[PDB]
């Protein structure tokens, strides 16, 4: 209804025909700057736009600390974990944990956990973000939007989009980033510049604050006013919506796990020609990860200023009309902006490129999850299976995960008060800390063994499910309509649960390892941090970097850290 003009239609059609044509033509080598660009592109998706703009609208700029935390963990990736992967001779984290502990149940568990994280944090998130963009662009309901998104993704994957991805992934993401720069310019022009945003944001509230529902009635100002600390990164340790101790400590765990264990992130990182190129690309990626504050978060705050009745809706029936869920409509923040600030030419291009990146992400995750299920899960249940059977099983798995993610769509839509980024970060905080703790203990504690690692993973899974399952079964609740969750199971912030779960699963790992047999030295050479410089052979790839460029790249990590530390204190 908004892109229903000749210019937007022409640009969308031309871009989709271009992607189809590039897909039809498609039918350790990288250097530092493609490495950094690829890391940034792999991390940044349309779910990031939706979530970061939505949380900027709902709560202010503290969510920027979610991206700004990533600089230091990307440094951890370049300086600590990429060397571990190269020294071990492995390309994934499951491969490292198979070499480090042996067995086959740790890898099987990690494959199952990765499948669940694909469904929850990747497939349903991308489907929901595409649906939100399509609903804001066309007025369609979320189910029609998701069916159309799946159909265009099917066209895209039957037309060789997987083959064209290896060329166009990073380029497409950075075209999206240029479009986001243009939209940031338009948005800051709408509010009167950078200082206009901070003039206006605290005064931006909806005037529709009374519900016809007798239970709700007049909504309190606390539920519809902007937070008094909206302009602050570091929020109150207990009453803050993003408490600073949580954001500083427990986000490191979850970010650590993302950057240092993600198969795609590590594969992009390990493609560097040398380790110096890997570290320089990590520096570039970290520098790039300061941009979502101004490209997504602040535009979301601007969207709250511009559309307070829609973005900052507070009465449940109004919110249900605005976006489909009664818990709030901050997720429409970035889409609406794209739909209403971009002109008749750039709006269609921005939507088309965002949706094509969506489609690529979906197709990539579909393929990766299907291969993961076929190789790590299905071939264990059926040891010897034919090629045709594996193809059929992969296709049926894609069908199954699509159905499950469509069923999970209302949950993603309503979760965390209708805040997508909080949903992603909460699921990650419930499922990642066990893996982070086990990986850290594997690196730095040689005494940790297969028993300890596996039972730490299982105990962490149980402890994280004891919070995740009640958090989703007690439903979605907002400030207006609080959920019945007993407030010791949901009132602690999910990044505090990240810390607790990390240390409890690590404690379980250590306790089980100490009461079980240890792994002799001969198996651990170049697999634990204590033996990374061990030339001895082991039982069950180049770390060298030129000293001249090693000092150059190290000072550039210090300079990047100082820039990020300035920005943390600037917006504190």
């Amino acid at each position: 209804a908004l892109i229903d003009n000749p210019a937007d239609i022409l640009v969308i059609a031309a871009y989709f025909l271009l992607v189809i044509g590039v897909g039809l033509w498609s039918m350790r080598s990288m250097v530092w700057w493609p490495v950094g660009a690829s890391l940034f592109a792999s991390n940044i998706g349309s779910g990031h736009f939706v979530g970061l703009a939505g949380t900027g609208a709902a709560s202010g700029l503290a969510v920027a600390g979610f991206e700004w935390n990533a600089l230091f963990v990307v440094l951890l990736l370049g300086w600590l974990f990429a060397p571990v992967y190269l020294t071990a001779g492995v390309i994934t984290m499951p491969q490292y944990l198979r070499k480090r502990f042996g067995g086959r149940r740790i890898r099987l568990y990690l494959s199952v956990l990765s499948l669940f994280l694909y469904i929850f944090t990747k497939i349903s998130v991308d489907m929901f973000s595409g649906a939100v963009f399509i609903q804001q662009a066309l007025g369609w309901n979320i189910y029609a939007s998701v069916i159309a998104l799946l159909g265009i993704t099917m066209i895209y994957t039957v037309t060789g989009g997987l083959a064209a991805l290896m060329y166009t992934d990073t380029v497409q993401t950075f075209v999206i980033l240029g479009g986001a720069c243009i939209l940031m310019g338009y948005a800051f022009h709408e509010v009167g510049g950078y200082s206009g945003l901070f003039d206006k944001y605290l005064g931006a509230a909806t005037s529709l604050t009374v519900s016809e529902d007798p239970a709700v009635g007049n909504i309190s100002s606390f539920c519809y006013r902007p937070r008094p600390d909206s302009y602050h990164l570091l929020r109150h340790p207990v009453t803050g919506d993003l408490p600073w101790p949580a954001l500083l400590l427990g986000l490191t765990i979850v970010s650590g796990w993302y950057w240092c264990s993600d198969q795609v992130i590590v594969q992009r990182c390990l493609a560097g020609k040398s380790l110096t190129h890997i570290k320089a690309g990590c520096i570039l990626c970290g520098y790039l990860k300061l941009t979502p504050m101004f490209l997504m978060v602040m535009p979301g705050m601007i969207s709250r200023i511009l559309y307070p009745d829609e973005v900052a809706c507070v009465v449940p029936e109004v919110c249900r009309r605005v976006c489909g869920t009664e818990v709030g409509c901050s997720n429409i923040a970035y889409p609406r902006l794209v739909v209403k600030l971009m002109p008749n030419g750039l709006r269609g291009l921005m939507l088309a490129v965002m949706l094509a990146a969506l489609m690529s992400s979906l197709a990539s995750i579909f393929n990766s999850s299907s291969t993961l299920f076929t190789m790590d899960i299905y071939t264990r249940l059926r040891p010897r299976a034919g090629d045709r059977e594996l193809l059929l099983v992969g296709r049926l798995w894609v069908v199954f995960i699509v159905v499950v993610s469509v069923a999970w769509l209302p949950v993603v839509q309503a979760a965390q008060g209708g805040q997508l980024f909080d949903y992603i970060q909460a699921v990650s905080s419930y499922l990642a800390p066990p893996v982070s703790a086990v990986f850290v203990l594997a690196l730095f504690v040689p005494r940790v063994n297969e028993q300890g690692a596996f039972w730490g993973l299982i105990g962490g899974l149980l402890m994280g499910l004891a919070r995740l399952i009640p958090e989703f079964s007690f439903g979605s609740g907002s400030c207006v309509q609080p959920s019945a969750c007993p407030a010791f199971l949901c009132g602690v912030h999910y990044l505090y649960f990240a810390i607790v779960l990390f240390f409890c699963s690590g404690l379980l790992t250590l306790t089980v390892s100490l009461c079980t047999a240890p792994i002799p030295r001969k198996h651990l050479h170049r697999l634990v941090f204590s033996l990374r410089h061990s030339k001895e052979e082991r039982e069950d790839e180049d770390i060298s970097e030129d000293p001249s460029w090693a000092r150059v790249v190290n000072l550039n990590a210090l300079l990047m850290m100082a820039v990020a530390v300035f920005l943390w204190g600037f917006y504190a």
Binding site: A562, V565, F566, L567, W568, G569, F570
Partner: peptide, 30 residues
């Protein structure tokens, strides 16, 4: 009552002192 740039410079100074400690320890003993 510090300005945002004052807070940024204070954070940078604290970070540089911390890095100076983490380098001087190595300069003394690994």
């Amino acid at each position: 009552n510090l300005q945002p740039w004052m807070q940024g410079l204070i954070a940078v100074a604290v970070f540089l002192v911390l890095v100076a400690i983490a380098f001087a320890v190595n300069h003394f003993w690994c």
